[model samples]
Structure formats: C-alpha cells, structure tokens
Target chain A: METPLEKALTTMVTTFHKYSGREGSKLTLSRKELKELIKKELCLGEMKESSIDDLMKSLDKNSDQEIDFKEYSVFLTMLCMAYNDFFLEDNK
Target chain B: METPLEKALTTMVTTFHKYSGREGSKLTLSRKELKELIKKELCLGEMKESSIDDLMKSLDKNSDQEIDFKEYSVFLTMLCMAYNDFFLEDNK
Candidate 1:
C-alpha cells in the first residue's frame, strides 16, 4: 500500500494528466487545458482573462506555449511553496 | 473544501513538517529528518546509508547540509516526475 505521501505524489501526477490529455498532445497541457485544470483542481482564487495568458507565458519554460511534465512539475512546486508558507504561518 | 490536488499539495507540505520538527529547525530537514521522511513517507525502496548521504548531497542545493522548503519542493517535484513516468508506462 502506498503511504499518504506517496499517494499525494501520485495524485499530483495523475491530476496533471487528467488535464494534459484532454486535447492537443497527450503528454502536455495546452492553454485551455491548463485553464481548466486551475479552475477545477487548484483553489487559486479568481483569475482574469489575461492572468491565465500571463501564467501560460511564465510556465511555458520552453517557449512552446504548452506545458510539458517538467514545466508542470515546476508549477506544482511553486504551488507547494505557497501552500507551505501558508501552513507555516498558520502554525506560527 | 480543498480539491484532491490541493489536498495533495497540503499533504506534501505537512508531511515535511511532521518529520522536520522532530529535531533542529522546524522549517528544515536535517539529514536524519530526511532519512526518516523517506523511510516513512516515500516508498523509494531500500536505501543504504551511503545512498541517503548521496541524496542529501544532491538535494542540498546551497550546500547548507539541510533541506529547506524550496529544496524539499524540488525533491517532491522530482518524485512526482518519477511517479508520472511509471504511470505513463503502466498505461501504455
């Protein structure tokens, strides 16, 4: 049986695929797919029309205008850092 | 009311705290803390002592000899990539 932490990592990977495989390349997330992912998966507040575009620009590290697994992993890591900051503040 | 993906990120953050707080700075994982974390939370298979030492050396980006949240986030991201690779292969 996978431990909770292991399961969490699995969830991260699966969630990325859940969106990435929706359209375009099955191995990467297009802009629309990424928007839908943030809408459904992360509670990252409301985003304006341009914000998503801005986000895509930032996350598309390779300038391919698509988010591959490695780039998505970096995105997730940034979210984890934000979550950790909130968690630490709450406990402090 | 966190989504599963959100919850997964939370788990990653909290799991680090669970082990990091055992001794030394609560915000960072010492070599011992990281060892326990891998032993308990990550099913990374059997790791010899030297392997753990090697992992610390690689993960300690600043060479502070400790794993902070940023470093830990990167570590978790790497794990997610590995898990994702396995998941893709299994599905293929």
Candidate 2:
C-alpha cells in the first residue's frame, strides 16, 4: 500500500505527465498543455487571463516558451505554500 | 471532499508542520527538528551523517541554521524528481 507521502509524490508527477504528454516534445509542457493542466488538475481555472499569463511568464524562467519538469516542480512548491497558509487559517 | 491533488498539497504542508512545530521557531525547522523529521519521515536516514549535513547545508541556503517553509518546499521538489525516476523505472 502506498503511503500518503509516497502517493502524493506519484500524484504530482502523474498529474504533470497527464498534461505534459498531450503535445509538443512530450517531455515538457507547452503553454496550452499547462493551461489545460491547471484548469483541470488545479482549481485555478477562474484565474484571470493576465494572471495566468504572468504566471506562465514567471514560471517559464528559462524563457524557453515551455515548462519542463523542474519548472512545474517550482509551481507545485508555490502551491504548497498557498495551501499551507490556507491549512493554518482554517485550523485556526 | 478534497481532490487527490489538493490532498497531496495538504499532506505536504501537514507533514512539514508535524515536524516544524516540534522545537525552535514554530514556523521553521531547527537542526534537531530537521534531523528527526528526516530520520522518521524520509528514507534518507541511510544517508551517512556527512551526507545529511551536506543536504542540510544545501537546503539551508541562507545559512540561517534553520529550514524555513520555502527551503523545505525545494527539498520536497527534489524528492518529487527522484520519485519520478522511481516511477518511470517501475513502469519500465
């Protein structure tokens, strides 16, 4: 049985691939792939166009026009921070 | 009714809090807190003491002598990469 911790790791990787494999190099996420992935896998769909664009820009730090696994990892790490705040707020 | 991705986020934060709250700054991980957390929560225990010291140094980039949430996020991101490889190997 997979532990929660291990399962979390798998889910993050799997979710990335589920979208990353949709098009382009199949190793990195194109903008469209990232958009759909965020809209589906995360609740950030209601995000504004400008917000998403800014996000894509910041995350595409290498300016490669594509998001590789490392970039996606940073995005998730950021999400974890937001979630951490939410978790603490709710518990309080 | 959290989604798996959402649950994963919570788990990451929760796991960090589980150890980060033990001693020193309630918001950061002291050396002892990090050591215990790694030994108990991660499989990196087999890591030689020197190796663990190296990890701590890398993780504590600010030389603050503590691991803050942001630093811990990077650590988790690294773990995700290793897990990604493990996942691929298992699938292959």
Q: Best TM-score goes to which candidate?
A: 1
Model 1's alpha-carbon lDDT is 0.80
- In the range A29-63, model 1's lDDT, one tens digit per residue, is 89888888877886667555588788888999888
lDDT value, residue A31 of candidate 1:
88
lDDT of 2 at A11: 86
lDDT string for model 2 (A5-92, tens) is 8778888889877788898877688888887777676665455667777788888989876799888877887888888788777754
DockQ of 1: 0.70
TM-score of chain A of each: 0.87, 0.86
lDDT of 2 at A18: 72
Report per-candidate DockQ. 0.70, 0.54
Candidate with best lDDT: 1
**Candidate 1 segments whose C-alpha is farther than 4 A from its true place:** none
Please, what are the lDDT tens digits per residue for candidate 2 over residues B1-92?
45788888888888788788888876788877888777666664365676677888888878887899888877887888887778678977
Worst 10 residues of 2 chain B by lDDT: B39-48
Q: Which 10 successive residues of model 1 chain B have the least lDDT summed?
A: B39-48
* Two-chain DockQ for model 2: 0.54
Model 1: chain B TM-score vs. truth? 0.89
